[PDB]
Nucleic acid binder design. Sequence first.
RNA 1: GUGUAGUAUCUGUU
RNA 2: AACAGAUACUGACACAGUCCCUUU
Lengths: 103, 396, 131, 71, 808
Amino acid sequence: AKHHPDLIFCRKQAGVAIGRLCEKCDGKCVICDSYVRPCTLVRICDECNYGSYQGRCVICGGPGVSDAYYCKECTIQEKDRDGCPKIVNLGSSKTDLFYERKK
Amino acid sequence: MFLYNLTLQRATGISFAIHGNFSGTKQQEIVVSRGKILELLRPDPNTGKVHTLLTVEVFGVIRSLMAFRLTGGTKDYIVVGSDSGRIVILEYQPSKNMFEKIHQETFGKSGCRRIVPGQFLAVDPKGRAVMISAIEKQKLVYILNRDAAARLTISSPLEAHKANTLVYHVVGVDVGFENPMFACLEMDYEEADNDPTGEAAANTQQTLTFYELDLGLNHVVRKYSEPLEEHGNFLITVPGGSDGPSGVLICSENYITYKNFGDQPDIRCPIPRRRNDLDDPERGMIFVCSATHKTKSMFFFLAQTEQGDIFKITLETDEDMVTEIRLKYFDTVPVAAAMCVLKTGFLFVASEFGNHYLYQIAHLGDDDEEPEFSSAMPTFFFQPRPLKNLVLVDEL
Amino acid sequence: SQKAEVIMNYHVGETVLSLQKTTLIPGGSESLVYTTLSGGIGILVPFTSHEDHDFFQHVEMHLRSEHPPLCGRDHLSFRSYYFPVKNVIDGDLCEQFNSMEPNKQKNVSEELDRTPPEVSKKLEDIRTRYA
Amino acid sequence: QLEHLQSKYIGTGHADTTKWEWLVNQHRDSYCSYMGHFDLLNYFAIAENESKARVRFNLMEKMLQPCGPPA
Amino acid sequence: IMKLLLKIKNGTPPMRKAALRQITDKAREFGAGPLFNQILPLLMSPTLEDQERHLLVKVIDRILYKLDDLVRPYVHKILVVIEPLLIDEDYYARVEGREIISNLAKAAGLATMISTMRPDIDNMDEYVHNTTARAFAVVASALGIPSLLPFLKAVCKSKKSWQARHTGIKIVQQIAILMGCAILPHLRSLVEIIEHGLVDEQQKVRTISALAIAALAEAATPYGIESFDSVLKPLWKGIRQHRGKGLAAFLKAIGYLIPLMDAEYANYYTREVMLILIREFQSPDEEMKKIVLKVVKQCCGTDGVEANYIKTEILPPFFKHFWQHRMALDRRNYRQLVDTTVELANKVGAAEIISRIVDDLKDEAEQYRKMVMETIEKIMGNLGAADIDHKLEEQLIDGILYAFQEQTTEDSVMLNGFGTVVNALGKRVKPYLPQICGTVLWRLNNKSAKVRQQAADLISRTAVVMKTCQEEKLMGHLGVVLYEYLGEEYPEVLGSILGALKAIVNVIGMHKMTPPIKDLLPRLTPILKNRHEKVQENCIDLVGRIADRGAEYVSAREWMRICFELLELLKAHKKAIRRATVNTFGYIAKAIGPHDVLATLLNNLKVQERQNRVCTTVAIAIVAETCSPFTVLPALMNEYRVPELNVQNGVLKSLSFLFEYIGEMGKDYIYAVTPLLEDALMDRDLVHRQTASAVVQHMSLGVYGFGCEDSLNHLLNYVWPNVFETSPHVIQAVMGALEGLRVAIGPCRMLQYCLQGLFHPARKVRDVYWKIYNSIYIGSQDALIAHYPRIYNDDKNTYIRYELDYIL
RNA sequence: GUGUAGUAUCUGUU
RNA sequence: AACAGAUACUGACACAGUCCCUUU
Ligand SMILES: [Zn+2]
Ligand SMILES: [Zn+2]
Ligand SMILES: [Zn+2]
């Protein structure tokens, strides 16, 4: 997601695994969050696709439902040839929201 | 104002001319690579004429080309490294007369870059792994395997990066059912970019390095690294395992050397010089290309010189230890960028500038009038003469 | 002071050492014949109608869409290697239609609102006229 | 973060970058490009009577220490 | 500093954030010493709830990131305070402690922290030992394990006490647990370190060594069998000579080791362990039972074993000893038994297990019914229904309806199982459909409004199979009944009914829908005002479906009323409703002319709600896309002239969205919007330039390849002077616009622009020019090769590429 | 309505 | 210039989420 500067990409060398998206993140681009013209499949590194993490959401980590894709603009800009777009951080909004809810 | 591009004649300049069994039959074909055109040729085994079957265009710059076959298989494949940051495996279809893409994997950006692999395409002699490398710092290893449905599969790439290094040539080492290994002509530049005086630019020499692919642990590690004497330009793979020994032949200026890891004293043989040569003695002398004709009875190498002389290298060895290298003058042909010797006794010469020729080997050139040269003998000279071991049958 | 405007760009992929405009076949139209350092001989020809231009552009777009380059390159990115392509339609990609599989042939032709024989004739007519 | 992406790639500079190393990168990339394309190598091998293997070897040799020693 | 910490501890979010920024930036200069001296007691203060602890660990993370070297004399206290956070029941707390310790490790010498943690290794407390082991695990995960291998090798053989060896093996196990498959290159060293403890004599070290080797085998699932070669015989002896906990640990280790081997080793070792497994099936302890269940499922899921072999030995005792009702209490045994049964079904076949279990499918117990329901549902999901015969499917149908008709409480398990079974059967469920319809209708009738929603979900699930079975009359009757049921009060049941209606409408077309849409849409109109998420979602999807495909049966005045309803609905707190709303606006603007809808949307750009205006702009762009752009573009450009700032921002954002939506057919509208973009890009306000840069980026990416560089050059000339800004959002917009223009125009023009200030004397300009140059360089450097400028060489350095000057 | 990152413009005290 | 207060704005930013190793 491009709306949170704190998040961090893994972007290691990609493997043969295919990324997945949950219900909330379905139909989006893993780089810019765009609903227009999915173009190319998303692949992730074998460290991300291991054990419990297998078949989870690329963006937030929820249960995987549908495949991930790159939008046409990212493919034109060759932003797809950069490594696994899996997010490794947990974010500041999520933890604070959880703590506020569990107040 | 719009224009429409058309072509009347395609490029006829060969750059890579690998050979193998692509039709799945007992007949061998040649896959030549123009600048951007992929073409497949079948020489007539009775009249010697060369025919063309497929002339597909790929819309890209082909930088490397090699073929392999899986152990126990009959049909070879084609591996392509190009300006696109992908590696592609192809397969010929005699029924449909087309090339089918079997696999493709992306590893980086596009274009002929410095730190994006695609220059060198070494492959394992048995067919268990393939390696793609860049001129600098980037080397990736893929593992090939077969499934229960008789189809090839590919694994995730394994990285073997190395900072501040340059690669001259990469070849696969015939290890004989052991862990696959790759040999490269590396050369470092870290310190030379930090010496204002400039002597660190000198005293820097190439190092021959071996990369062993650990199948059990699924990672690649470099084991041996020995400095060299001269600067090599390309390597040759020596058939090993059950037939012949392992190791690689290193070609340098005015020399040829055999090296092998573990325990081996290297053997060097100087390149014979032409008799009554009119050239300036200041310049050196190197090889340009080579070939291999391994066979059940024995194996021999071929090599092409700058002047255009074909030598015939034969390795003499003990039960398992190599002793000397024996060079002999075979014939002379126009300078070529790639040579290939097939069964039935044919030689295909892909000239780097001009027409292409096909020769038939009538004699192997042994114990003939001309003498032989050896590393055991304590600057040899030879007299070039018209063709004796070759007969021209076709011209392209 | 005064500057000239670029009206066309292309990337042949092979160094060109001769450009010369003349007529090749008697009774035809003149064209810009060029020859390259690798041994290729090509021509560049203009369209005789706007409908032809739009038709060929749409055919090229569809073939680029469904018939990608064999070695994994991007055709538009290849033709824009140094400068973005301008006002040139690649005829080799367009003529690659004639050797494609029948299912894809009918699919593309129906997207063209034509039958495959009509597309073949239309592609052949310009070549047999200019060359 | 954009700066992590650009840091890894080899060739990128920053504020405290000198001219010699910038042109060294330019020359190395130019040599690699010459090695890459084919017809440009044909041009170089026709302009001077040298085989393509010799031209490739010379270009590889020039990769170490181009543009002279540093300051 | 104390005031800032107190303000962060409690207060309003704005002043809290301000105090956080101050106590970061200025307190870095103030010093780390007093900072920690005042912060640590707050976290170590007892009886403190989690909010203050989270805020304090956040501020410590920030100051530690900004102050790296100065925290060296405080690592002991930082570990004391943070280390208990490693053991917690909260995933977030565990994670945050993990990166806290990782950042501290990366900001301190490894030897320093190793020496700090040495005195705490020799302890027997369940807290200190485990926390220290996990701290060592995360520290070794950072910095690379080879830097810690010699220390572990030394400490595993310590003769001061056995507990040092126990801690070493536990550290290895925790490293395997946390670091994962990133240990494969260094497997043999750890195996050699732990095998000595494996072959030891004390029970504790034997058990911990077995656990660590199981963890290593689990880390290396497909690889490493050769590295596991000095431990096979100790395990195959220990299984026979041990009872109790050690036997369980050895069984776990061998079960994890089994999948790695080849076929012959697999079958030999799996029977050699099958003897003890069959012996241990009747173990009174539940932990041993779940362990042997895991082991047997691992053995079954291996290439080595054989279907008939498993059928002849494993199946009878397993079914006799495990398929009972006493195990239903615990969740772990529930999961393990269900998954093991599913894996066995995958191995031998679906029928061989379904025929065994369908008989007791309808057992009087409820938990047993849940168990069989889940097992059958998973088996049907994987295998399907090709292996089921006539009698088997009849029994399955009778059992599933009998179980579903007796629903004590709310349970998604039975509904999911019924849906999976009916979907798997397919056409074969045709004779059973009327009974299902009658039962679901009866369950939908009344009864406390708790089963009606389940019936609605069930019919929404089975509508597709009734469609494939050619039973349109029954689903039409169900649809009309749901139509009279549209007026009930409870929100969840209403949402379920709406979902069922939407499913039916999708299944059977609107041309022959038994309740006509002319009566359905006016009924649905007042429902949209219900401020509940569950109702609103399904209502808006149904309305959008009707608008998209059944727009022929509705009058324009009704469309205008529902358009006002959608304008109200654009205020929802959830994004899916807003996306559905904008799609409905697009469908309506397709149904009618794009004039009445445009006026309503254009008048909504003054609601003083940021997300509402963004949604309205997206809706305007969707209308402009579904209709032809030139119909609505003059209206937007005229609307741009309103003196209000938000209206202009909305117009610019709508233009950006429209240019993103239309890629190729957007070159015909560059001229129309060029003067407006030039006006927007003027240095008066930041947001105008930001949004104009976004428009430029999207347009340049869209028109790429079609030769529109002439106007793009002018737009570049107008957008370039904005790169010397400081606000991050404008910076991001400008960089995106520059990248898009580089793609559309070419690297030569951008290189010419950035080539002048690349060596500027000012330090604050070179960095910006270098960022721009790096962005240009990473993409298409091979063109930069041909676009470089000629440099004249110096006295000692050659700067001219003489190879390009050769002439033939 | 609330919380997570940022930004701009005004006013008071040194 | 520093401290503090107030008012506006951007990010198709988010809304019982759920934790998916927590080890003997
Ligand atoms: Zn990753
Ligand atoms: Zn998600
Ligand atoms: Zn995208």
